[PDB]
């Protein structure tokens, strides 16, 4: 009548959580906005995916002057 | 002439303070200035006949704890939302 | 030293308390077992602390 539709979401959120070790090319956070920002040695894609450039351990770091979540990459 | 006779609780927190509430008592706290927060119990029905006057909340109180008549004033009070009771009082050291 | 016995059964209880008895090796009522001591063993006994009797 008026209430028939919905759409399943694109299975978003954090994929490689903060603390463990990732490779290069894999994705950390598939997200909508710039919700977790442009952290150290990660790229924000076209659809603002957080993908690492180097290898090693991830770390969820607060930074910035407006309290923004940056997602970091350092060499393990 | 308003006085207070009380002693100090053994174990703190929720499950102990509920039995202390059941056993005709209720907690309090005494803070302020230089002395640390003193976490004592009180007598329930022996201060129900004392909180019935505004001089409780406008006059000095002498608490006899540790052999020391502390000179306090009433600070804040909590009550059971559907009971004629008392729950928890603050007392500043002033 | 420690000692452990199991007095209540485990059938109608959780799979979070049907795998601590794996790590305690208790396979029957009365299956008394001595193990080591550490904070981890006390933490693995305070999850099933309604159905064992410690013997010390």
């Amino acid at each position: 009548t008026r209430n028939g539709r919905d759409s399943e979401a694109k299975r978003l959120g954090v994929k490689r959580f903060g603390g463990e070790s990732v490779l290069a090319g894999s994705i950390i956070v598939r997200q909508r906005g710039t919700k977790f920002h442009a952290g150290a040695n990660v790229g924000c894609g076209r659809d603002h995916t957080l993908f690492a450039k180097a290898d090693g351990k991830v770390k969820f770091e607060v930074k910035g002057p407006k309290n923004r979540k940056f997602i970091s990459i350092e060499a393990e | 002439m308003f006085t207070i006779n009380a002693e100090v609780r053994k174990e703190q927190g929720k499950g102990a303070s509920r039995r202390l509430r059941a056993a005709n008592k209720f907690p309090a706290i005494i803070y302020g200035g230089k002395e640390a927060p003193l976490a004592i119990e009180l007598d329930h029905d022996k201060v129900m006949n004392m909180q019935a006057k505004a001089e409780f909340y406008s006059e000095v109180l002498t608490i006899v704890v540790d052999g020391k008549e502390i000179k306090v004033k009433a600070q804040d009070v909590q009550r059971h939302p559907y009971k004629p009771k008392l729950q928890h009082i603050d007392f500043v050291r002033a | 030293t420690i000692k452990i016995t199991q007095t209540r059964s485990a059938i109608g209880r959780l799979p979070k308390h049907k795998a601590t008895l794996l790590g305690l090796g208790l396979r029957r009522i009365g299956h008394t077992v001595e193990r080591e001591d550490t904070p981890a063993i006390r933490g693995m006994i305070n999850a099933v602390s309604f159905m064992v009797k410690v013997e010390e």
Partner: protein
């Protein structure tokens, strides 16, 4: 009566009814009548109690209502099989949890206020009892 002039969306869910109160003490006047049980207050009962208590106050003093019903309760119409959607809003209900106050009064003395609140207590589905003005 009371009713919302505007809801953002049309029909709300049921929820549940857990928790103690928030508006615990007398906040404006001198005398109060306070709920004890757990339940649900419609739009009609509170204004019926408002008339049944105004009739005892005889336009003297002042009274305050604080609760205001806004839950869009519904009904499924009679002789319709259970499917084919939800129903249309029939009346507007307030939620009353144990301890919440409903009305406050000033001016008119307390011994009149006993029976003046007892009459409006006798038209209400959950047991209430009187409380006074507490100086802190």
């Amino acid at each position: 009566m009371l009713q919302p002039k505007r809801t953002k969306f049309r029909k709300m869910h049921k929820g549940r009814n857990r928790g103690l109160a928030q508006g615990t003490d007398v906040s404006f006047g001198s005398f109060g009548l306070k709920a004890v049980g757990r339940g649900r207050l419609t739009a009609r009962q509170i204004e019926a109690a408002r008339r049944a208590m105004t009739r005892a106050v005889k336009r003297q003093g002042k009274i305050w209502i604080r609760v205001f019903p806004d839950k869009p309760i519904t009904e499924k119409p009679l002789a319709v099989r259970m499917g084919k959607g939800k129903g249309n809003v029939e009346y507007w209900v307030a939620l009353i949890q144990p301890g919440k106050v409903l009305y406050e009064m000033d001016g008119v003395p307390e011994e009149l206020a006993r029976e003046a609140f007892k009459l409006a207590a006798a038209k209400l589905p959950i047991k209430t009892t009187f409380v006074t003005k507490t100086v802190m």
